[PDB]
Every structure is written in C-alpha cells, then in structure tokens.
Amino acid sequence: SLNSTGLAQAAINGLNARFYESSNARWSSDEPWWISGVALTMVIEYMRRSGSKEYLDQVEDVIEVQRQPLSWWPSGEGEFRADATDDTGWWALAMVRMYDLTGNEDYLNISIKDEAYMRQWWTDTECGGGLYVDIQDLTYKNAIANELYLKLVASLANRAPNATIYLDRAQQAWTWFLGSGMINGVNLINDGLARDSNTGSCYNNRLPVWTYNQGVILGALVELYHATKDESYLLSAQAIADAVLSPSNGLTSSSGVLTETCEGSDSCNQDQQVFKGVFALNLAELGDAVAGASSDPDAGQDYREYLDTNMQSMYANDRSEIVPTLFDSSTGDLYDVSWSGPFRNATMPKQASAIGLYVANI
Ligand SMILES: OC[C@H]1O[C@@H](O[C@@H]2[C@@H](O)[C@H](O)O[C@H](CO)[C@H]2O)[C@H](O)[C@@H](O)[C@@H]1O
Ligand SMILES: OC[C@H]1O[C@@H](O[C@@H]2[C@@H](O)[C@H](O)O[C@H](CO)[C@H]2O)[C@H](O)[C@@H](O)[C@@H]1O
Ligand SMILES: OC[C@H]1O[C@@H](O)[C@H](O)[C@@H](O)[C@@H]1O
Ligand SMILES: OC[C@H]1O[C@@H](O)[C@H](O)[C@@H](O)[C@@H]1O
Numbered sequence: 001s002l003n004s005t006g007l008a009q010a011a012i013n014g015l016n017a018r019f020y021e022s023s024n025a026r027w028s029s030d031e032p033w034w035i036s037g038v039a040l041t042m043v044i045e046y047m048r049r050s051g052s053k054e055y056l057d058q059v060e061d062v063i064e065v066q067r068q069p070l071s072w073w074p075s076g077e078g079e080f081r082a083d084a085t086d087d088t089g090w091w092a093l094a095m096v097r098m099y100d101l102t103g104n105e106d107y108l109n110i111s112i113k114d115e116a117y118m119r120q121w122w123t124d125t126e127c128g129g130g131l132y133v134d135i136q137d138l139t140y141k142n143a144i145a146n147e148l149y150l151k152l153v154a155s156l157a158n159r160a161p162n163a164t165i166y167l168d169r170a171q172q173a174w175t176w177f178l179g180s181g182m183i184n185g186v187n188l189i190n191d192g193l194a195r196d197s198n199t200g201s202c203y204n205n206r207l208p209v210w211t212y213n214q215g216v217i218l219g220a221l222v223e224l225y226h227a228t229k230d231e232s233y234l235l236s237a238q239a240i241a242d243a244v245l246s247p248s249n250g251l252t253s254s255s256g257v258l259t260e261t262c263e264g265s266d267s268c269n270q271d272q273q274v275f276k277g278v279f280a281l282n283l284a285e286l287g288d289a290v291a292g293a294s295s296d297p298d299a300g301q302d303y304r305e306y307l308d309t310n311m312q313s314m315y316a317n318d319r320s321e322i323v324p325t326l327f328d329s330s331t332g333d334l335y336d337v338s339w340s341g342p343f344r345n346a347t348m349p350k351q352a353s354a355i356g357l358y359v360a361n362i
Contacts, residue, residue, distance in 0.1 A: 014332030089148025215279030277356025
C-alpha cells in the first residue's frame with residue numbers, strides 16, 4: 001500500500017528543495033563532493049527504474065559542471081578524476097548508470113577514462129594487488145575504493161567495446177579481493193588492509209564493518225555474473241547479503257532494520273550518513289539478478305521483503321515533510337540517519353541515503 005515511486009520523488013524533491021545549489025550545479029558544497037556523486041546516482045536510478053525523466057535536465061547540468069577540472073585536483077584534468085580513487089569511482093559508476101538511462105556514449109566514455117585513471121594506482125608490489133585510495137599518499141588500500149573499481153571494470157565488461165580486457169581486469173580484481181582477507185569469517189567486509197611492519201604482507205585491519213562495503217561488492221558481483229553467466233558470482237553475493245540480513249551480525253536490528261554501527265552512539269559523520277542507501281540500492285540489484293537467474297517465483301524474495309520492511313520503518317519513524325511558505329511552495333520529504341530512530345535533522349548525505357532505499361523498492 002506504499003508507493004515507492006511517489007516517495008522517492010518526494011524524497012528527491014526534498015533533497016533539491018533544501019540542498020540543491022542551482023548556481024553551483026551541486027548539492028551541498030559544505031558536504032563531501034563524492035556524496036553529490038552518490039546523490040546523482042540515486043536520481044539517475046530513480047529515473048531508470050520509474051521510467052520518468054523529470055530530473056534529466058538537472059542531472060545533465062550537474063554532470064556538465066562537475067566534469068570540469070576540480071579546483072582541488074587540477075592534475076586530474078576533470079572528467080571526475082579526483083585526488084582519491086574512491087571519489088572518482090562514485091562518479092564513474094554514476095556515469096555507467098547515466099549511460100544505462102540515456103544510451104549516450106559520452107557518459108560511457110567518462111567511465112572508461114575513469115577506469116584508466118583509477119588503475120594508475122593499482123599496484124601488485126604491495127598486498128599482491130589492489131589499488132590505493134589516497135592518491136597523494138599511497139598509504140591505504142581499503143575496501144570501498146577496490147569495490148568501486150571492481151564494479152566499474154565489471155560494468156565496462158558488459159558495455160565497453162574492448163570488453164575482454166575489462167572482464168579480465170574484473171576477474172583479476174575479484175580474485176585479489178577474495179584473497180585479500182578483507183572478507184572476514186562471517187562473510188562481511190572490514191574497512192581495509194593493514195601492512196606488516198617487517199614482512200610487508202597485508203591483512204584485514206579489523207576496522208568497522210560499514211554497510212556500503214557490503215553493498216558495492218554486490219553490484220560488482222552482479223555485473224560479473226551478467227558478464228560470465230556464472231551463478232557462482234550470485235552465490236558469493238548472496239552469502240554477503242545474507243550476512244547483513246542476519247541479526248546475529250549486528251547490521252540488522254531485531255526489528256529487521258538496517259542499522260549503521262555508528263547509529264548506536266550517534267556518531268555517524270558526513271560520510272557514514274550516506275552508507276545505508278548505497279547498500280540498499282545494490283541489494284535491489286542483487287535481488288533482480290537472483291530472481292532472473294532462476295524460475296522460482298520466490299527467488300530473491302528475502303531481499304525484496306528486507307527492502308520493503310526497511311522502507312516502512314523509514315516511512316513511519318524517520319520522515320519529516322517540508323512545510324511550504326508564502327515564498328517557497330516546495331513540497332517533499334526529509335529524512336534523518338536512523339531508519340528506525342527518530343527524525344531530528346536532515347542533511348544531504350542522510351537524504352541521499354533515504355532516496356536510495358525508496359529507489360531500491362521501485
Ligand atoms: O572532497 C570533498 C570536498 O573536497 C574539498 O577539497 C578538499 C581540499 O580542499 C583539501 O585540500 O584536500 C581534500 C582531500 O580530499 C579535498 O577533498 C572541496 O573543496 C569540497 O568542495 C569538497 O566537498
Ligand atoms: O567513514 C569511514 C570511511 O572513512 C574513510 O576515511 C576518510 C577519508 O576518505 C576522507 O577523505 O578523510 C577522512 C578523514 O577523517 C576519513 O575519515 C576511509 O578511507 C574509508 O575506508 C572508510 O570506510
Ligand atoms: O590499515 C590502517 C589504515 O587506516 C587508515 O585510516 C589510514 O588512513 C591508513 O594510513 C592506515 O594504513
Ligand atoms: O528491484 C526490486 C523491486 O522490483 C520490483 O519489480 C518490485 O515491484 C519491488 O517491490 C521490488 O522492490
């Protein structure tokens with residue numbers, strides 16, 4: 001009885017009414033730039049899944065301005081090539097989705113330039129593989145930058161003309177990730193890798209399990225399945241998603257609600273506020289891939305029910321409607337960080353995460 005399409009549109013309208021900067025073609029310049037990339041993904045994915053085009057003009061504006069050489073990383077020469085590889089990876093994946101929505105080769109070309117830029121910081125000398133996140137420093141190979149890269153090459157393996165070298169890169173990247181140790185004993189992914197002071201060998205740094213690091217990897221494996229038709233990639237994704245859904249692992253509350261590890265102590269920073277929606281969108285991708293790979297009508301039904309359950313809780317306990325004024329008649333919905341906890345304030349990363357959950361149920 002809940003209309004996820006209308007709620008996503010209200011959530012996007014709330015996102016624009018409070019956080020979109022027309023003069024900058026960006027959401028919230030006081031927030032991390034990469035989260036504007038995530039927001040762009042959610043808006044593109046809303047249009048892709050709902051069949052609507054109401055934000056297409058706005059998305060094109062954002063792309064055209066955020067394409068330009070970044071003032072804080074001119075040496076990237078624009079096209080979203082930034083001072084960290086994960087920043088680049090978020091926009092690169094948004095361009096994959098833009099290409100999926102529009103069929104405009106221009107966006108596919110951006111993702112291709114991004115893949116080649118990110119790969120510059122893949123090294124086999126440390127950790128036997130993987131890329132660094134901090135381009136200027138080269139001190140950290142983490143989960144998210146390698147999950148983004150892996151989903152990027154796996155996506156390009158299904159879309160780019162030289163799809164073979166991208167499929168080989170994806171298969172090689174997944175083999176490295178699987179062997180990295182970052183996937184722990186309960187099939188959840190810790191934050192990144194530490195390096196042995198004496199031996200130089202790398203190991204799971206046991207930093208927190210963040211929801212978005214259980215998400216991007218699902219989309220990556222889904223694209224690897226589409227590229228190979230090997231259901232082993234789906235089964236591996238399902239083991240990771242199942243671990244998230246199991247309340248015994250602390251990511252899913254006793255009410256069945258996705259919960260970031262920082263929500264308990266009310267310490268979720270500007271980055272962590274956006275994590276849950278990224279997982280939700282990728283989980284919906286996994287659900288679609290699972291239901292299409294088997295003739296069982298109940299295939300992937302647990303993931304849909306999970307997303308549905310999480311939507312209603314967010315719908316009921318985390319929502320606050322904007323009240324219009326005599327000057328601003330904007331209507332929409334605002335959302336806080338906890339999908340079960342109360343609504344206290346809204347921020348752009350919280351709102352972006354909100355849209356992702358609604359879009360995940362379209
Ligand atoms: O990355 C998001 C934000 O980055 C800001 O640039 C930062 C530089 O000012 C600083 O010198 O180094 C960090 C390293 O990441 C840069 O991110 C932008 O000014 C912001 O607009 C952006 O939201
Ligand atoms: O929130 C967890 C994530 O934190 C990331 O480190 C941040 C950098 O990306 C950012 O640019 O600078 C701040 C400095 O406080 C860092 O918190 C990790 O790179 C991620 O792996 C981690 O999930
Ligand atoms: O694996 C631990 C890593 O933690 C990160 O937060 C730091 O930025 C890296 O320098 C460090 O190597
Ligand atoms: O992709 C997942 C979505 O697929 C749609 O076909 C269903 O109607 C939604 O309920 C579900 O959340």
